[PDB]
Amino acid sequence: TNRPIHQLQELLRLNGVDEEWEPILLPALMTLEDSYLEWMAAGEGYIPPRDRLLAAFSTLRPNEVRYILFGQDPYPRPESAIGYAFIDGRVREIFSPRGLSREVNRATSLRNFIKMALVARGSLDPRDTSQEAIAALDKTLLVSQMRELRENFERSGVLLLNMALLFTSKEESRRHIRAWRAFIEKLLEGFEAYGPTLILFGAHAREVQKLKSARGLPQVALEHPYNHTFIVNEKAWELFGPMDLLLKR
């Protein structure tokens, strides 16, 4: 039975992925069932668009991956899903004259993660992460765009990897994650030599215990940033603190 190797190399080029990713990424992708791959090539009826499915691989090279931060599947919103775990494509500006921007405040998990980073870097008192305290901050050294927070994740070697790389509807998400599980298992198999650390937010930890190759990699399990308590989660301070993800490079 023929495999769509030429089409998959095309998909990598369309996403801007370097050819160094082929030894790890082509096997992984080849675990998807052939009809699913044909539908995926058709490019209709799912988010993010086909040219963004692998955006998490479009800058990092395999030996630069120090962490793999997991999400479930793309955000249920066309403008939000942009091929990265955790990064919400609705958010552009991080701050406003009033504190955090409206789009940051709407995205609960990113709101609490950004407050967490402001605490861990010594800008905010952990007791007061209010919009007033944030507005009072001197932000001349800090990022101004969600794009730059993503870029800083990548500078720190973080592969922002969703369990499934595409979304069709809320209903079909479980089926998609199941269809991508072999892809994830093969991809983690491929990272065994590099030994990057899995960052597991909340429930993502439990699910990761189902895969074989995940046991071959170090793991750090955290409270999910959706919870406001995440802001003063000191394990988060110690993991993400050294990354200084809000510092403008």
Automatic annotation (TrEMBL):
Keywords: DNA damage, DNA repair, Hydrolase. Its EC number is 3.2.2.27. Residues 61-225 form the Uracil-DNA glycosylase-like domain. One of its GO terms (biological process) is base-excision repair, AP site formation via deaminated base removal. GO terms for molecular function: uracil DNA N-glycosylase activity. Pfam families: UDG. Excises uracil residues from the DNA which can arise as a result of misincorporation of dUMP residues by DNA polymerase or due to deamination of cytosine. This is Uracil-DNA glycosylase. It comes from Nitratifractor salsuginis (strain DSM 16511 / JCM 12458 / E9I37-1). The lineage of its organism: Bacteria, Pseudomonadati, Campylobacterota, Epsilonproteobacteria, Campylobacterales.
